[PDB]
Amino acid sequence: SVSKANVPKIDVSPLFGDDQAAKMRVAQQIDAASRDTGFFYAVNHGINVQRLSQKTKEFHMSITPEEKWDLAIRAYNKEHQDQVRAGYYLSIPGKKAVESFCYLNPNFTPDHPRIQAKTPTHEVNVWPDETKHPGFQDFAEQYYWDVFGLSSALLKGYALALGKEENFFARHFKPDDTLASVVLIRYPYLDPYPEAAIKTAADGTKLSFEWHEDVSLITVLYQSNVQNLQVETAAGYQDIEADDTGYLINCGSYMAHLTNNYYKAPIHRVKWVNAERQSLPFFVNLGYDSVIDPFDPREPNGKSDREPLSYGDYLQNGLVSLINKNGQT
Numbered sequence: 001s002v003s004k005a006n007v008p009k010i011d012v013s014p015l016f017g018d019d020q021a022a023k024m025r026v027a028q029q030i031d032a033a034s035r036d037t038g039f040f041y042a043v044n045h046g047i048n049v050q051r052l053s054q055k056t057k058e059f060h061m062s063i064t065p066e067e068k069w070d071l072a073i074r075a076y077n078k079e080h081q082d083q084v085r086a087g088y089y090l091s092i093p094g095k096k097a098v099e100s101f102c103y104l105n106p107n108f109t110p111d112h113p114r115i116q117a118k119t120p121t122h123e124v125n126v127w128p129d130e131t132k133h134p135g136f137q138d139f140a141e142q143y144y145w146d147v148f149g150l151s152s153a154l155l156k157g158y159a160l161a162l163g164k165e166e167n168f169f170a171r172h173f174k175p176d177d178t179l180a181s182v183v184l185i186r187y188p189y190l191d192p193y194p195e196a197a198i199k200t201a202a203d204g205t206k207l208s209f210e211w212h213e214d215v216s217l218i219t220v221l222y223q224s225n226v227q228n229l230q231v232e233t234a235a236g237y238q239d240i241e242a243d244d245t246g247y248l249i250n251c252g253s254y255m256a257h258l259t260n261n262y263y264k265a266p267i268h269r270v271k272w273v274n275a276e277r278q279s280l281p282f283f284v285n286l287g288y289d290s291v292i293d294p295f296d297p298r299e300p301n302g303k304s305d306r307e308p309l310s311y312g313d314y315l316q317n318g319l320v321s322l323i324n325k326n327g328q329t
């Protein structure tokens, strides 16, 4: 009974080049999608997503229970007090199906000034043994920078869309300090599938992850070709079609704050599907002290009655809030 969400495919390739009129024509498409359902597929993005999926599969399918405890975040292993964000998020057979691996900026090394300062939301990544997962760390770090590049080009499009210069958001999205994360999520096939890992929405839809707005500026997501996402619109929840050749893009609640909800963070959820699949989000986060002054593109003077919020404050509060709402993943 559910209708299909309008999720246009936008060729973002001009955002990598110097043809300004072409970039404006992409910016208009990003504006139309952001003001309608809030989602689009970025195509011609240049990233080898089949190899991303193959390397991710090799990792998820070969990592062992011992390795998962050794990489686990603090929620699963009290010995790893410094790992709030980065590391392994374990499944609980019989109870919780999903499991994942999160990593942050590869530049957050032991000598990074924010690591030295023990500033919240900055952590040094943890990695499996190289001999057990040859090439994985290097692949994953290079992927961070490939999707960082895509994200910077998308942020030039969002800036132009909002009537700003193209570096409006990108000047706060920097390799040396971005709080952006990759999450490599495995949604397993299980027979029988644990009922405790299946939630039910108020409308009866079986879910794996409840309604939410993202904690990000924008979210840049690769998924397998198994339909599962829905977006809430004025006409109710609608199905987002899968496309394992594109990146699904949406805004998160920092973009809604900065634009006075002109570009809403769309509410969306994940249906339960008993299928072996991948969900590989990149959360485009700024630096800890990044503050963009809020504005309102719908007002002639561009003024908004919102207070500036630093990205670090936003991110640390939003990540806790999302766990309290929808559970520890």
Ligand SMILES: CSCC[C@@H](NC(=O)[C@H](CS)NC(=O)CCC[C@H](N)C(=O)O)C(=O)O
Residues within 6 Å of the ligand: 084, 085, 086, 102, 180, 181, 183, 185, 209, 212, 214, 215, 221, 229, 268, 269, 270, 279, 281, 283, 319, 322, 329
């Ligand atoms: C379509 S919702 C995005 C994809 C994925 N969901 C998620 O990734 C959920 C909701 S956006 N996000 C989260 O749980 C936030 C993870 C933050 C990360 N540990 C970090 O530290 O930066 C899924 O369930 O498939």
Ligand SMILES: [Fe+3]
Residues within 6 Å of the ligand: 212, 213, 214, 268
């Ligand atoms: Fe989300």
